Every structure is written in structure tokens, then in C-alpha cells.
Amino acid sequence: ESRKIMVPPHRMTPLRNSWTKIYPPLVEHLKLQVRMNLKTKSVELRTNPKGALQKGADFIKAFTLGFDLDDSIALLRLDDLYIETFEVKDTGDHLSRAIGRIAGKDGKTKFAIENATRTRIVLADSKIHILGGFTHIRMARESVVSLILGSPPGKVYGNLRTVASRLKERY
Amino acid sequence: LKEDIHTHMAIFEQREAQAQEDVQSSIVDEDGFTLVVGKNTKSLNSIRKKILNKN
Amino acid sequence: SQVFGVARIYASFNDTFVHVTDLSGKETIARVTGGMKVKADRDESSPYAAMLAAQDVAAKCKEVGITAVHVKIRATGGTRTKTPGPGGQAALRALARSGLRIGRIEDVTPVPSDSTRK
Amino acid sequence: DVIEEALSRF
Amino acid sequence: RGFSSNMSHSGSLGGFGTFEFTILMAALLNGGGINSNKILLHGFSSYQLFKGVIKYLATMDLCHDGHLQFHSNPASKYIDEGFQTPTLFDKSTKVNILTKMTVSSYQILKEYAGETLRMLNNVVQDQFSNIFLTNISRFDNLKYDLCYDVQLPLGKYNNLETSLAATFGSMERVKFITLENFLAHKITNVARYALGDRIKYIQIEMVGQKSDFPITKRKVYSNTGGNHFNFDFVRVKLIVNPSECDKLVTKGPAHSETMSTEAAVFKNFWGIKSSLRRFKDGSITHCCVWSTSSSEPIISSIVNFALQKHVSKKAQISNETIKKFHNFLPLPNLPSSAKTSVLNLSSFFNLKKSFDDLYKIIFQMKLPLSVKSILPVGSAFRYTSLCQPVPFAYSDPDFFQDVILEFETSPKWPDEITSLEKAKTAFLLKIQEELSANSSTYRSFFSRDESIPYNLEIVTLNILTPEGYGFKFRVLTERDEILYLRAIANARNELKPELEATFLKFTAKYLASVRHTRTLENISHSYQFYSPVVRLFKRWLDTHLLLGHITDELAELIAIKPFVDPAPYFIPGSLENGFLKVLKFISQWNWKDDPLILDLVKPEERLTLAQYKGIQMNFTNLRNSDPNGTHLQFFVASKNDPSGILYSSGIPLPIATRLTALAKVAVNLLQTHGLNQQTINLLFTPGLKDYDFVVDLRTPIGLKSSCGI
Amino acid sequence: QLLKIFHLKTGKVVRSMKISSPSYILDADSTSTLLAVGGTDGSIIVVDIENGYITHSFKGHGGTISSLKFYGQLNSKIWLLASGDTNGMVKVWDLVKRKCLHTLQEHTSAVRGLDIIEVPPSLNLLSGGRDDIINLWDFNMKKKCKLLKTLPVNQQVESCGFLKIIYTAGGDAIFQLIDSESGSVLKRTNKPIEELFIIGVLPILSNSQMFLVLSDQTLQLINVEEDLKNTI
Amino acid sequence: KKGQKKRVVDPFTRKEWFDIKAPSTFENRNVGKTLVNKSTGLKSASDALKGRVVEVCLADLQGSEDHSFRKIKLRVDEVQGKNLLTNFHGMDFTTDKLRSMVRKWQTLIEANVTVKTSDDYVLRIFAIAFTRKQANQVKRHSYAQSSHIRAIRKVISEILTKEVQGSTLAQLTSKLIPEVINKEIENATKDIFPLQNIHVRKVKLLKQPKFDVGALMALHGEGSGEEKGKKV
RNA sequence: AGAGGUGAAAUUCUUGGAUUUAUUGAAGACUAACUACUGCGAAAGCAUUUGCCAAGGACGUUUUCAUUAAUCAAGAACGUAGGGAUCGGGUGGUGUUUUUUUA
């Protein structure tokens, strides 16, 4: 079996930057015979004549989602995570200050989300990408949709305290 | 039969375009009588037979 | 070699119905609304409530075994606002991203052709 | 193109 | 109709008769309805009296649900149930006047009521000679569909117990008069239960029976061929629902765990053979496999087992006519073709699939002038060709089927007729050039056609399809019709009718042929025996040497004539009944005062009164212009050709009179000598007649492995 | 995503895995350590439970996969797998050669409730379904045959035979015990007046006692070992 | 809310899958699958579905995205061993195509003829033709003279009621698949007006003759029920 | 197991299955997109197709009659010049769409 993965022209140049440090952690290890179709902006991973195809596929799928190489190797290791995308939709008033309430200042509220629930999130101007544990993704998405529905940052910090204690303490 | 009907079409379209050009170029009579003709008719034999069929 | 339902999304105002029926359209599978995913009688047409409604519809749809969907979006039509509401594109997008192939997107809002206002 | 010359005029 | 008032309890078609007819007319006088609503007044005469009588008998059941009640001493009504026998109660006598005939005889008489009602209530044509003045009772296989003759050599009345497996009891001799009576009622009940939804109607009739015994003798003291009972052997006459003859599984009830009485009597009646099976639906149902053969219809096998299992164990069955002509049918080289039926059309469907892939690969390409439509017109595409079409079968002259194809209405066309047909050749040159360019697994060539006169430059494109078939392609345009019409108009006045004959051949070959094959191919799936009766008719007609003059569409029309109008008879549920209905009709048929109007319609868009009168009127002036049929012999007019002279043209008067004479000779042989193997061989004798000329011709190779039969 | 729980105090997830498709069938072997997962795609993964890893892939299957079964007693040698599909097929699999053995295409509905046993190798298997066939096959190592199907009136949901030799049939709130080489249900339970039916049979103490789960979320004990000698 | 709600109905174990097969006028005759019920007594779920429509897209019938629009409707009218051999029931554009076609500073001609075919199927078949701006035309409008409208509508009704009344349903479907009567309308009405894209947009059925399972089987192909190996 | 409806609520109906889904059938109303600074009517008003009934405008005209006209009481029926386009008709030109012996 093979798999194509489309890539956009806003993660293409950092993929050329990190291109030398993906297939040497892939082809000798998680073999997956690889081409990169620049002719139609896709990456081709076909099977080995000598179920790792899913792992290589969501490896570079997390990369084209736009997560770090540390996170992508943290997807090779620890095969239990989940990537997730959701866009807001809930123009200015409901876009600009809403993503401002997401980021806080300098990504400190996003950093509070991330360090609270052990996930890793990134976001473009409109979308949100969250990867990690499944219940963590559930909880982090709940807190983010709370603060884009409209909640005080101190009150969602209290909810962040509760969920961080719940998902970093056992049971 | 390729070259045969090639030659047949190549003479047919020649005499056809010649006939139509002869029709709607200009027809004055022995005296002054310009002949009424259609916009896209093709043969004096055609207008002759239709003026026969409208007897 | 997939198997297709149709989506029959009704993106009305004040509510959002999504029920994937069979290919004929007769035997419906897993109706949820946008009003049984939040309970406040205000946000029951929200894009977020519609998209999580769509999430658990896709869950029960994969339970049955239907792996792909012809989607038919429907506004309130007729003699009413004739545009799809807030939850339609949200529920379609959620059904797309939650592991379910989508083909033949289609708008089946009922055009009046001179209904009664007079 | 003998057959194209035969299938002109159309 | 063969209904005299003797008895059908004794195994003979009859029992109903004239004073029974009187009794029901006068019983329907004083009422007839459930509220005794007056069915019959003498305000109307015998015609509407007869129509109301047949309406009441056809719409008021007597056997199984409801029957008439009346008392002579006094209304008449319709009571609700039925006594599993023909019934009408007369309470002033307490008698059951319709208990002289049996259940199947009343069943077939109610059918005759419905059928003559259908052909009587119509206001379209007049068919009084079709309804009265032809004795349909003259032949067995003409009023019936097929026949079996059970020969039972029981020996003696004491030898019964080891010569026959039927009952022998006080309870059967108390309700049955004698041996033929109990075997008759047992054999009609086991035929009814054996077939059920497999036939239309059964009639049982013991022949060799006679009501004649002398003064000096105490009884019919007669050695009746292996017994001394008043019957020689048992006519088992069947008329069949033709849609379930060769269906190879009949179905009992399904499987409950508690094996109820219906599955019980099914397994008792069917013994070791039937069992419960799975299906693709997944039902677990009681059924039995019927190994279909070509020469044998499985109706004979199931009646063979229902005879040799229950009424006797060493009696035998005579039916040889069906197998006698079924090897006169040509058997194609197909996988297990002997086990294939004759109602199977898999060869025609195979070339239809090949034609459809050709259709897609000729539509998915580019012309300078696109295809408007292609339409096959072939005899195989209307289920008629004599080879049941096997691939690669070149030796049949109609191996090459013909397909008309027309492009869109471009007003760019050449003017004169040779130039336009040469432009059509140019298009065919282009299509085979791209065909060999792209899909070289098809191959092709060109062939001149001269089936239309006086056009010297008309070719057809023949292709060989790697599924193994061959197709002619003829281009039609919107221009050839008006070109032939204006050629007609400007021709010299003593040269008119020959060019009119050329245009008639063009219309028959290109234009009306499409609606011809469309209509009868559409109707062949409702008249299922059509392709076997036309194929046997055509092989008969080529053995008797007429196809060199007559055309195959005309033979097809003569064979559809007994189907789309089968009155007074049935539609034919078997090949023999179809073929001798054809020959009986065309032996009956005249020319001088006889047209042939048929409407190729579905049972139960038709031809109305106005179009009927127009067809008859142009027939009338046609052959008062033509005195006796000097050069126009037949007149076959349909909805698709109200002219009627389209297919009948061209045949010489000796050929047409030879056909009619051969039909009269055949019906003469049928009413004289009876059906037999040598009878059928004499029916397919050449009749070479030594009329002035015999040549014997043999090409240097044999060609039946190459024609695929 | 699959999770295994060490059933002691530390009920921490010893290993979770993320599987391809959502799954409605796990089968364990007669001992522990062998677990088989079947998705809503035809992907049958076999996993070690001591230290949790995929150990057998088994990708080439037809449709959404219904019930499947292991084989192997304590310290056996064969260690086979059943793998019956929904469209009708059953492809029997073995892990010791990482291979298929036979492919069976006799059902029409969802093949559910299948089991293998031998008597001296023979290795015959029963395989029921949503239809009403019971469908035993001979199932040698290299060759193949099929025995009687016994044709109940039921809707067989998860029934496994091979008792002491009687065979179970459940799934219409009716427990049938069909007999060997015959069709005669002799143990047929009282069908309740409602229609909610058996989803699952459960052997207790090596087929001695029996649990029947019910669609109104109840569970019943049967004592099939006493009722085999006992009489409804 | 206040009532009592009949907690469990579990309505997919009793549900059954059929699949539908289009007639041979198309090429990708397999289309999809369909839920019905358990085929049981008192309902006869084998024949409880035998009038259902299905609404496919012609791109998914023909494997070519060029006619992505024009969703057609098939009708199941028989059963043959889980295969629903269907037939034609209608045709309709998507709303996308007609809204994308209708634009101002041009006018549109409607037509619709009710007509019986050579069979007893009466249809009403529709037609839309827009008015084209001629090449070299400099003015704004290119409307129709509103007495050329009547001549266009007359000849378009005439030639499509000549395409029907003649050309039975197989030929009708095979002639409105590859868009040829639109080109016929264009080549017969490029006299009166230039007429950019002409379409048929709708075929509605109104009556049918009868079932005729022989012809209904001849539309697809031959195949009959036969035995199965019982072994009991 | 919710669904109209609401600014929330309230109220309405819903386990006698509603809302939604599919297949039909009936009923009367109405002619959306096309629809414009375009058309017609004395005004108010006037948009589905086809047929019929009559009417009206403008244009064309080397047709006819010869002041027959104009305006309202009373009464009657209805509720400043120039330019660019565009609609309807006509004339002329000469390129393309068009076609050709059916009108």
C-alpha cells in the first residue's frame, strides 16, 4: 500500500529546511519507500518489498499541520497520541479579539493550556491544531471553546488548574 | 477508394462552388432584367425546378 | 470500495438536524439534532453544537458501517430565509474531518417558484 | 491527410 | 369450443351443454344479482342476451367462491362459497345442475367466457367468424398447447394391485363410478398439485372411451389395449403459462422446525427427490431441481414423475413431437447447450454486450461531425436469426448484423445521391481509420451493398469484434429521404414506379426497419415463444425453399400474426402449438378479400377505428387497382406501416401460391394422418417436386462446426 | 484506541494502542497473553498482553469484521485464528506460520459465534450467523470439507457449541441445544413475552455453567452441565 | 419527557443489507447498498421495499466528471438474490447548474412536453435554452424578439416529442446520457437564434405499463436461482 | 427525546413516534431566478405554456374620403439646444453566424 500527502506552500520551505532530518530518521528505521512529488505538491510513501505506513503518514501529516520535529519524533515514539484540527466559526469581533483571548499575550494562555493538559497545540490565523492524549484533547478543546465562547481568563485559569490536577494526577 | 472518393469530392466541391458562384454573382438578361435569387441558393437548375414545381 | 449514505443536513435557524439516511433515503440512521448537544434554548443552533452533533452522528454511522457520505444541505427554504444557517458548514466540515469520506456536495433548499405571500 | 481533405466542408 | 353435455367426470372435454345454457339464461331472467338485480331482460335480443350471459359467467365464479342459487317454485341470488366443483344450486329440486363436468372443465369454460368476452366487447373490428364460424375442436394440439398420452397396461382388475400404485377402496369406489373415474380424478388432482403455478390449465381426457355396447352384450366387453375398461389411453392435454415452463425449481413451503402438514404432503408427494435448500436470499425452502434439457421441456419430466410415482409404477408416457422438432431446431456450440433451454437468450445477450462495448468505444471518440445515434436493426437484435448466435460463426450469411448510425443534422452535405453516399463512405473511412488507430483489437473492412437498387456507390463498414462478432454499419442522413422524394418528383413519367420501388426498399431497409425491430423486440419479452416459433418457421421456409424471394421481416410478421391476434385460441405456450397455429392460419388465409392488420401491442398505442378504417381503405383501393394479385400478393399492415405494401413487395405469384398451397397441404396432412415422427419428417421434406430443375451443390468444405451449430 | 488494564491495584493502562478502525470484537485465547482485535475494516491485529505490542498484522480481509475466535489450550502447538467476516466469508488464520489456511464463502449474513475443536488431527469448526445456518466444516490442515448445518428457527447471535456433544444456539431470547448429526432441539428455554434477545453466551468454568446476556441489560445463569443430564 | 420511553430496540441486528444494480444503459451498474429489515413473516421485507427510489449522480454512474451534474433517479421494482435490479425513474439537474446558468442580460426559453413513448411510459420532459450573445455583437442585451420565442419553443417541443414517441426507454436513456438531443436542438435552431447551452434538465415519469420481469431482466442480463448444497 | 416559537423566558405540541427522512395523493393560491432606469395600457394596473376571440399602437403605402379638426361646460365609461444609448418598424450596405428543390 501507498499514501500521498498534500503539502501547502506555507510549510514547504521549512520542509526543505528539515528535509535532511526526516527521511534519515525514517527510511533506515521505518522504511517506507519515499518520493516527494513537487510537480503536484504531495509526498509519496509506498510500502516495502522487504503497519508502519500509518505511522509515517501521520508523521508527515503532523509536520504539514505545522508541529515541531521534536513533536513529530514524539509521534514516532509514543504511538498513542492523536492529531486534531478545528476552526473557530463561532470577522473582527468574533475573530481578532477571540484569537487574542486564545493567545493571551506572547502565547502565555496557549502556554498555560499546553503545560496544563500535556498536549501540544499550534494555530494559524483561524485554525487550531491540537495533538496529544485523547482525553487531554477533549479537555483542552473544552477550555478553548469556553474562552472563545466568552469567559474571564481568571475563571478559565481556575478550570485549567482543575484539569491540570486531574490529568497529571492519577485516576 | 480513399483516393477515389478523394478525387470525387475534389471535383464535386469544385463544380459545386463554381455553380453557386455562377448563380449569385450577377444575372442580367439580354435586356435589363436582374434575376431575383435567394440568399443561400445554389443552382440555376434548382431555381428552375422549383419554379416548375410552383406551376 | 466504500459504502455511501446521504447526509440530509437541515441547517435551519434555531436548530440543526443531521441524520445520515440510507442511499435510497428511506431507512434513517442515527438522527441527532443541534438541540440535544447543549441545553440552554439559545445556543442550540451554534456551529460548535452542530459540529459535535455531527461528531457523534459520524460515530454511530461508522458503527453501522457506512464509510462515506453524499451530503445534501438544506436551508429552511420555501417562503423563508433561503440561506443555510450557521451550523451547516460547521457540521459538514466536522463530518469531513472526523474520518468520513465526502462526495457530491449538494444544496437541496426548496425554491418556492412563486409561493404564496399574497 | 487524404481523409481530412475528404472530410473538409463539415 | 367442444363443450357438449355428456360428462367431464369420465375424462372428456365437455359436460356443459345447451339446456344448461337455457337454464342459466332463464335463471338470470328473474335476477342474477346478490340483491337479485335483473341480469337479463328480453328488451334486448339474443346478441345482448348472449353478451350478458358471458359477462355473468366470466365475472361470477361458480367453482370455488360463490355460485348461483335459484329455485323453480322465486328469486335467484349469488351465494358466497364454492364446493370445489362447478356448482349452481336449485333449491326447489335441491340439485347441482353443473355437476356433470369437473373443476378443470369449468375452469377452462370460464376462461373461454373471459376470452370471447374480451374479443366480443371491443368496438374496433368485426370478428364474428373468428368467434363462431371456426370449429376450434377439430384438432387437439391446436385448441390445446401440448399433449401427453399415458399408456397404462394394467392387465386386469385383479392385476391392479401390482400394476398400478393408486388407491383401491370402498371410499373411492363409493364416489367414483369405475376405474377410469378414480384414475381420472386422481390424475387431475396430482397434475394440479404437481404443476400449480406452472401451467395455465390442465384437461384430462381418456381416449378409446366409447358409450357404445351392443344388444347381445352385458357391458363394454372390449380389450382396450392391456385392460378391459372403457378407455384406451389417457390424453393429458396442457395449456401452459409460458413464463414458467423452463424454470428449473418449483417451490414448496419454507422450513419451520415443527414440520407442518403442507411440508409433510410436499415431501410425501415428492419423495426422495425434493429437499429443502438455501438460496441467495438465504431462505430455507422446499424445492426440487429440474435438470433442464434442450429437446426435453421439464414439464414432461415433472409430469413423468407425477405419473410414474403415484398412479402407476410401470406405465409409460408418449410425447415425441416436442423432441421431434427440437432437434430440427439448430443447437449452437455453447457450454452445456444441450442442458440449456430453448427459452434462454444468452447468445443474443452476449452479442448485445459486445455491441454495447462497441457502442461505448464509438461514442467516446471524436469525429468532425458527431454521432446523433446508432441503432442496431439486426435480426439477432430482434431474436430471429437461425443460428443462435455463437461467436466467430462466419458461415451464417446473417452473421454480420446491421446497425444504422446517423450523425447530427448538419446542413453541410453534398447534393446529388452518389456524392452523399460517397460522403457517408468518407465518414466510414474516418471511423475505421481511428478504430484501427486506437483500438486495434477490433478489426474491420469495407463491403459494397446492393440491396438498394441503382445506387452504385453505397458501402457498409463491417467490423470484427474480439468478443467474436461482426457488425455492419450503414450511415443514415436526414438528406437521403428528401433526395429520393425529389428524384421521384423529377423522374420521367413512365419511370415512376420503379424508382418508387427503390424508395420502398429504402424505407424498408433504413427507416421503418428501426421501429419494426424496436416494437417486436419490445414485445418478444411478453410473448416468450416468439423466437423459437420464428426460428422453426424460418428453417421450415428454407427447407421448402422460399427465402430467396420472401424477406425475413415478412416471415417475422406472418409469425407474429398468431400471437398479437390469437383469437379464438390461446397465446401459444409451446412451440408446436405456435407453429401449427401459424400454418393453420395461413392455410385459412386468403388474399383477394383478406388484408392482414395486426397491432404489436402488449396483452390485456393500439390501433383505433380511424386508423383501422384508413388501413382497410387503402387496402381496398390498392387491390381494386390490383385485380387479383398479379404482382402484389400479401398485405401485412401494422401500426408502424399503414401502407402495408412495404414487405410484401417483390415476391412472385408462384412463390406466394406455393406457400399457401403448402400450408393447405400441411393442414390436410394434420387433419388426415395425425402427428407422428414420419408426419413431422414429411412436414420437413423438401417437396422438391422436380419442377424443371435440380442442381446439387457442395462447396469444398463442411461448415457446421464453422457456423457453430 | 485500545487499552489494556492490569486488573490489580495498578489498573494503569499497561499499553494503549491506536488502531486503524473502531472495533466491536476482541477475542482472547483459552489461556491469557493472546488477544485479537477486529475493526470496522477488515484488519485483524493480534497483540501480546504481557508487554503490549502488535504481534500479527493480518490485513487482507474483505469487509467489516464480525466475531472471530482463537484456538489453543494450555501449552498447545497449533495456535490458530478464525476471522469470520460480515459479507459471509471466514478466512482461518494461523500465527505460527503467519499465514492463512482456508477461505470459506458459504454464509450470506454476518458470521457470528464461531468456534473450533478437534477429536483424534480433525479440527472441525462451527460457524453461525444472522441467518439460520449453523455450518460446521471439517477443516483439516491442508484439505477441506463441510458437515451438516441443522437449520434453526432463530437469529443466531454469538453461539458456540462443542459441549459434552451438544451445540448452543442463542440470539432470539431463546437458547437451543441442537444435537450432533441430527436436528432436534431438546433444550429450548422459555422465550419471554418481550422481543429483546440474547447478545452473548458466556462459558463459566470450562463450559460447565453458562451466562446469557439480554438486551435489557440482564444476565442469567443456566447450568448446562446439569441440564445436559436432565425437561425443558 | 414525562412518558415512558421503551428503552431498547437495538435496530441494526435485525436490519439487512441489499445492494442495487443499475440497468446496462450505463456501465458502472453497481451503485450502492441499502438497509431494509429482517425478511420475516407478517411483513415480507423482501417485498416491502420494491418501489423505492434512489438518487445517484451521473458522474458516479459513468466514471467521467464532465457531467458532474444531472442526478438521476432509479427505482427498485424487483428482488433477485439480494441484488436489486433497478430501472429508470427520472432525471434532474442539480440546483448548482441551473443557478450557475441563469444570469441576466439574456433571456431563457422553457419547454416541456408530456408524451407517451413507444412503450406505455408517459413522461413530461423539460427543456431550457438560453439566448447567446453573438460573436462580434456589441450591444448589451441579446434578448429574444418574443415572437422568436414562440417559434423556438414550437420547434423544440416538436423535436423532443419526435425523440420520444419512438425510441423506447432504453434508447431514450441511451440518447440523453451523451447529451445528443441538446446538440440536435442547437443544430436545428441555430437558424433563429444562436442559443448558448441548451439542456433538458428534467425527465418525469407519470405512468408505467406493468412489471414485465422478462424485459426487466433483459435490461440487465441473465441469471437464475439454482440449488444449494444442503447436507441434512 | 426532543421540536415549533422567544429578546430571553413563558407558551405550544412530542413516547398515541412529533420535528426531520422517503414515496405518493388532494386542495386552492401564485407565477420566483430570467426582470432591465426595458415593454404595454386612458388611468388604476399589467409577467407559466398553448389555442381562440376581438381590440390597439407605431411603421410601410404613388390606396380612398375631403375639414370631417381642436377644447371643456352639461353628461357618460372605468378606479433653451446638443449628444450617447435602448425599444418597435422601415431602407440600404456587405462580412460572419446562417444554409442547400419541402413551406
By C-alpha distance, the chain E residue nearest F129 is E282
By C-alpha distance, the chain B residue nearest D3 is B2
CB contact under 8 A, A80 and F1: yes
User: Could you identify the residue written with the cell 456507390?
Assistant: E457
Region label for F166, one of left (φ > 0), alpha (ψ between -120 and 50) or beta (otherwise): beta
Nearest to E144 by CA among E675, E552, E696, E593: E675
Q: E382: buried, middle or exposed (CB in 10 Å: 19+, 13-18, 0-12)?
A: buried
By C-alpha distance, the chain D residue nearest B3 is D2
Q: What DSSP assignment string belongs to E582-615?
A: HHHHHHH--SSS--EE-----------HHHHHHH
Is the Cβ–Cβ distance between C78 and C115 less than 8 Å? yes
H/E run at residue A108: helix A108-117
d(CA F190, CA F172) in angstroms, rounded, equals 11
User: Could you identify the residue written with the cell 485523547?
Assistant: A134
Residue type, F201: V
Strands E88-90, E67-70: pairing is parallel
Is the Cβ–Cβ distance between E270 and E281 less than 8 Å? no
d(CA E568, CA E576) in angstroms, rounded, equals 17
Under DSSP, the state recorded for G131 is P
d(CA G64, CA G62) in angstroms, rounded, equals 5
Nearest residue to nucleotide H33, by CA–C1' distance, is G102
Cell numbers standing for residue E669: 396432412
CB contact under 8 A, B5 and E422: yes
Strands F114-117, F124-127: pairing is antiparallel
Is the Cβ–Cβ distance between E269 and E196 less than 8 Å? no
H/E run at residue E151: strand E146-151
Under DSSP, the state recorded for C73 is E
d(CA G195, CA G134) in angstroms, rounded, equals 9
* Spacing of C-alpha E440 from chain mean position: 43
By C-alpha distance, the chain G residue nearest C28 is G35
Residue E505 half-sphere exposure, CB side, CA atoms within 13 Å?
Answer: 14
Answer for C33: CB within 7 Å of strand H. yes
- The CA-atom distances, in angstroms, between E669 and each of E578, E675, E679 are 17, 9, 8
Distance from CA of B28 to the nearest CA of E (A): 27
- Edge-first strand listing for the sheet containing A33-37: A2-6, A42-46, A33-37
Nearest to A132 by CA among A115, A155, A108: A115
d(CA E593, CA E622) in angstroms, rounded, equals 12
Q: What DSSP assignment string belongs to C23-72?
A: SSS-SB---EESSSS--SSSSTT-HHHHHHHHHHHHHHHHHHT--EEEEE
d(CA E595, CA F49) in angstroms, rounded, equals 91
Cell numbers standing for residue F89: 466469508
Strands C68-74, C9-10: pairing is parallel
d(CA F138, CA F122) in angstroms, rounded, equals 7
Q: Chain G within 8 Å of F216 (Cβ-Cβ)?
A: yes
Three state DSSP letters for E57-71 = HHHCCCCCCCEEEEC
Omega cis (within 30) before E642 = no
CB contact under 8 A, D6 and E369: no
- Which residue(s) pair with C106 in the sheet? C72
3-state secondary structure of E532: helix
| Length of chain F in terms of residues written | 232
* Spacing of C-alpha G44 from chain mean position: 29
Tell me how crowded residue E395 is: count the other CB atoms within 10 A of its CB.
17
- The CA-atom distances, in angstroms, between C118 and each of C80, C82, C114, F41 are 14, 18, 10, 56
By C-alpha distance, the chain G residue nearest C60 is G12
Distance from CA of G18 to the nearest CA of C (A): 11
Nearest to F170 by CA among F137, F209, F211: F211
Cell numbers standing for residue E536: 422453426
- Which residue(s) pair with C74 in the sheet? C10
H/E run at residue A115: helix A108-117
Residue type, G128: I
- The C1' atom of H49 and the CA atom of G150 lie apart, in whole Å, by 10
Sign of CA dihedral A113, A119, A122, A127: negative
Q: F75: buried, middle or exposed (CB in 10 Å: 19+, 13-18, 0-12)?
A: exposed
- Edge-first strand listing for the sheet containing E401-407: E371-376, E401-407, E469-476, E459-465, E443-448
Is the Cβ–Cβ distance between C53 and C39 less than 8 Å? no
Residue type, G56: V
Is the Cβ–Cβ distance between E201 and E570 less than 8 Å? no
d(CA C107, CA C84) in angstroms, rounded, equals 9
User: Could you identify the residue written with the cell 491527410?
Assistant: D1
- Which residue(s) pair with E405 in the sheet? E374, E475
Q: G84: buried, middle or exposed (CB in 10 Å: 19+, 13-18, 0-12)?
A: buried
**Contact: chain E with chain C (3+ CB pairs below 8 Å):** no
Give E281's contacts in chain G (Cβ within 8 Å). Answer: 39, 46, 79, 81-82
Nearest to F69 by CA among F140, F123, F5: F123
Give B3's contacts in chain D (Cβ within 8 Å). Answer: 2
Q: Chain D within 8 Å of E265 (Cβ-Cβ)?
A: no
Is the Cβ–Cβ distance between E526 and G212 less than 8 Å? yes
3-state secondary structure of G113: strand
User: Could you identify the residue written with the cell 425478511?
Assistant: G39
Nearest to F88 by CA among G84, G28, G38, G82: G82
Angle (deg, nearest 10), helices E575-588 and E530-543 = 60
Q: Which nucleotides of H are covered by protein (CB under 7 A)?
A: 1-10, 14-17, 19-24, 28-36, 48-51, 85-89, 95-103
Give B13's contacts in chain D (Cβ within 8 Å). Answer: 8-9
Answer for C65: CB within 7 Å of strand H. no
Q: What DSSP assignment string belongs to chain F?
A: -EEEE-SSS--SEEEEE--SS---EEEE-SSSSEEEEE-SSS-EEEEETTTTEEEE------SSB----B---TT-S--EE--BBSSS-EEEEETTTTEEEEEE---SS----EEEE------EEEE--SSS---EE---SS---B------SS---S--------EEEESSS-EEEEPTTS-----B----SS---EEEEEEETTTTEEEEEETTS-EEE--HHHHTT---
CB contact under 8 A, A51 and F20: yes
Q: What is the CA angle A112-A113-A116, rounded to 5? A: 75
Residues in contact with E180: Cβ distance below 8 Å, sequence separation at least 6, in sequence order: E10, E11, E206, E209, E229, E230, E231
Angle (deg, nearest 10), helices E179-195 and E103-121 = 60
Q: What are phi and psi of G206, to 5 degrees?
A: -130, -35
Answer for E621: CB within 7 Å of strand H. no
Answer for G150: CB within 7 Å of strand H. yes
Tell me how crowded residue F83 is: count the other CB atoms within 10 A of its CB.
27
d(CA E588, CA E595) in angstroms, rounded, equals 13
Helices and strands, counts by H and E, chain B: 2, 0
**Contact: chain A with chain D (3+ CB pairs below 8 Å):** no
d(CA G169, CA G175) in angstroms, rounded, equals 9
b/e A44-83 (16+ beta carbons within 10 angstroms → b): ebeeeeeebbebbbbbbbbbbbbbeeebbebbbeeebbbb
b/e E154-177 (16+ beta carbons within 10 angstroms → b): beeeeebeebbebeeeeeeeeebe
Is the Cβ–Cβ distance between G45 and G27 less than 8 Å? no
Q: What DSSP assignment string belongs to E298-366?
A: HHHHHHHHHHHTTT-SS-EEE--HHHHHHTTS---S-TTTTTS-SS--HHHHHHHHHHHHHHHHHHSS-
- The CA-atom distances, in angstroms, between F103 and each of F88, F91, F96, F122 are 11, 4, 18, 17
- The C1' atom of H68 and the CA atom of G147 lie apart, in whole Å, by 38
Q: E685: buried, middle or exposed (CB in 10 Å: 19+, 13-18, 0-12)?
A: exposed
Give F59's contacts in chain A (Cβ within 8 Å). Answer: 51
CB contact under 8 A, F86 and C63: no
Residue C13 half-sphere exposure, CB side, CA atoms within 13 Å?
Answer: 5
d(CA E288, CA E272) in angstroms, rounded, equals 10
Sign of CA dihedral E577, E580, E584, E585: positive
Give G232's contacts in chain F (Cβ within 8 Å). Answer: 148-151, 183
- The C1' atom of H65 and the CA atom of G16 lie apart, in whole Å, by 92
- A 76-105 residues inside an 8 A Cβ radius of C: 85-87, 89-90
Is the Cβ–Cβ distance between F114 and F84 less than 8 Å? yes
Cell numbers standing for residue E588: 385459412
Answer for C57: CB within 7 Å of strand H. no
- Which residue(s) pair with E471 in the sheet? E401, E463
> Which of F19, F64, F109 is the best substitution to test chain C (most C C-beta atoms within 10 A)?
F64
Cell numbers standing for residue A96: 481578532
Residue type, F66: S
- The C1' atom of H65 and the CA atom of G148 lie apart, in whole Å, by 39
d(CA E37, CA E34) in angstroms, rounded, equals 7
Is the Cβ–Cβ distance between G37 and C7 less than 8 Å? no
**Contact: chain G with chain E (3+ CB pairs below 8 Å):** yes
- The C1' atom of H71 and the CA atom of A51 lie apart, in whole Å, by 103
- The CA-atom distances, in angstroms, between F191 and each of E543, F150, F154, F170 are 72, 20, 11, 11
Residue type, E206: M
Q: Compute, in degrees rounded to 10, the torsion defined by CA atoms E119, E121, E123, E125.
A: 20
Q: What are phi and psi of E445, to 5 degrees?
A: -160, 175
H/E run at residue A102: helix A96-103
| Residues 151-180 of chain G in contact with strand H via CB under 7 angstroms | 153-154
Is the Cβ–Cβ distance between E101 and E14 less than 8 Å? yes
Nearest to F141 by CA among F92, F200, F178: F92
Is the Cβ–Cβ distance between E375 and E515 less than 8 Å? no
Both ends of chain C: CA-CA distance in Å? 51
Under DSSP, the state recorded for C78 is T
Cell numbers standing for residue E314: 410401470
3-state secondary structure of E527: coil
Answer for G5: CB within 7 Å of strand H. yes
Resolution of the PDB structure in angstroms: 4.9
User: Could you identify the residue written with the cell 421485507?
Assistant: G45
CB contact under 8 A, D2 and B13: no
Q: What DSSP assignment string belongs to E227-281?
A: S-SS-SEEEEEEE--GGGSS-SEEEEEE--SS--HHHHHHHHHHTTT-EEE--SS
Strands E636-637, E596-597: pairing is parallel
Answer for G105: CB within 7 Å of strand H. yes
CB contact under 8 A, E278 and F133: yes
Q: What DSSP assignment string belongs to E394-462?
A: TTSTT-SEEEEEEE---S---SSHHHHHHHHHHHHHHHHHHHHHH-TTSEEEEEE--SSSS--S-EEEE
Q: Chain F within 8 Å of G186 (Cβ-Cβ)?
A: no
> Which of D4, D5, D7, D10 is the best substitution to test chain B (most B C-beta atoms within 10 A)?
D5
Sign of CA dihedral E91, E95, E98, E104: positive
d(CA A102, CA A147) in angstroms, rounded, equals 7
For A90, which of C48, C93, C97 is closest by C-beta distance? C48
d(CA A104, CA A153) in angstroms, rounded, equals 9
CB contact under 8 A, G224 and E370: no
Under DSSP, the state recorded for G89 is E
Q: Chain C within 8 Å of A142 (Cβ-Cβ)?
A: no
| Residues 70-99 of chain G in contact with strand H via CB under 7 angstroms | 73, 98-99
For E410, which of D3, D6, D10 is closest by C-beta distance? D10
Q: E642: buried, middle or exposed (CB in 10 Å: 19+, 13-18, 0-12)?
A: middle
Measured CA to C1', the nucleotide nearest G99 is: H33
d(CA E375, CA E473) in angstroms, rounded, equals 10
| Length of chain B in terms of residues written | 55
- The CA-atom distances, in angstroms, between F125 and each of F115, F138, F154 are 6, 7, 20
- The C1' atom of H2 and the CA atom of C94 lie apart, in whole Å, by 23
Under DSSP, the state recorded for G80 is B
d(CA F114, CA F136) in angstroms, rounded, equals 9
Domains of chain C: 1-118 (3.30.420.80)
